[PDB]
Structures are given as C-alpha cells and as structure tokens.
C-alpha cells in the first residue's frame, strides 16, 4: 500500500526543490533520510520533513514496517505566486514573483 504526505504552499520555487527530490527518487527510506541529512540546501530541510511525515503516516494509519518502505513517487508542483512590487531606477517598477511549490512524497512497501 502507498502512503502520501504533502507540503502545500511551501515557500520555495519548484525548480529549487526538484534538484533535491531527484536525489532520493526510488531509494529506501533509510538511505533517503541520510542523503537529505548531508545535503546543504534549504529544500533538503523541506523534503526531509515531508518524508518523515509520510513515514509516520504509514506506521500509524497503515500498520506498515519501516525497513521495507521505499520512495516510490516524489514530485514537486508549482503553487500560487505572490506578486510584489520592486522599485527600479528613474521611476520604473518591476513585478517580483515569490514562487511557492507543492511537495508530494509517496512511500510504499511494494
């Protein structure tokens, strides 16, 4: 049985989180957690808390065992963007996008 945990509206762009999500796709969750511990990215902190939550959902809500779970699916989607105004020279105004993302981790023992 699969088990999903998600972080919606995570304050980072999807391109920055997708670099970290490509490291742990298909790995055992024991191995995937220690890859995330020694990756020096802010997105590695965000993906680790979603993976830790998918692990705990599978033990509690699904009765699984920890030593057989693998990261079957992991994908990052784009969330809504927050529009901000940035003053430039000579009266110019630019528009700042503050991109968010939806992280989804699926752990399965099969």
């Amino acid at each position: 049985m699969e088990t999903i945990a998600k972080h919606r509206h995570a304050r980072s762009s999807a391109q920055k989180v997708r670099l970290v999500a490509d490291l742990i796709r298909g790995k055992k969750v024991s191995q995937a957690l220690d890859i995330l511990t020694y990756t020096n990215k802010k997105a590695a902190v965000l993906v680790k808390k979603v993976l830790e939550s998918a692990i705990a959902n599978a033990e509690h809500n699904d009765g699984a065992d920890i030593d057989d779970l693998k990261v079957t699916k992991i994908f990052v989607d784009e969330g809504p963007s927050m529009k901000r105004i940035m003053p430039r020279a000579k009266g110019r105004a630019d528009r700042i996008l503050k991109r968010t993302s939806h992280i989804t981790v699926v752990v399965s023992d099969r």
């Binding site: 000579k90 009266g91 110019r92 105004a93």
Partner: protein, 34 residues
C-alpha cells in the same frame, strides 16, 4: 500626462525611459542623418 495607470500609478510622465531622444544619455551626434 498618464493619469490612470494601474501598472505604475506613481508616475505620469514616462517617456524619459524608453524614448531614445528623451533619455539623459541621448547625444545629438546620434542624429547625424542630416
């Protein structure tokens, strides 16, 4: 004057930005086809 701009409400006279002959770096030697 541009009095109801919603993209840039803070400014009314903007052709010092994109019109080349109204920029502060315009030199009249660029107009040599005379």
């Amino acid at each position: 004057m541009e009095n109801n701009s919603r993209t840039m409400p803070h400014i009314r006279r903007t052709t010092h930005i994109m019109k080349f002959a109204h920029r502060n770096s315009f030199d009249f030697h660029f107009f040599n086809a005379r």
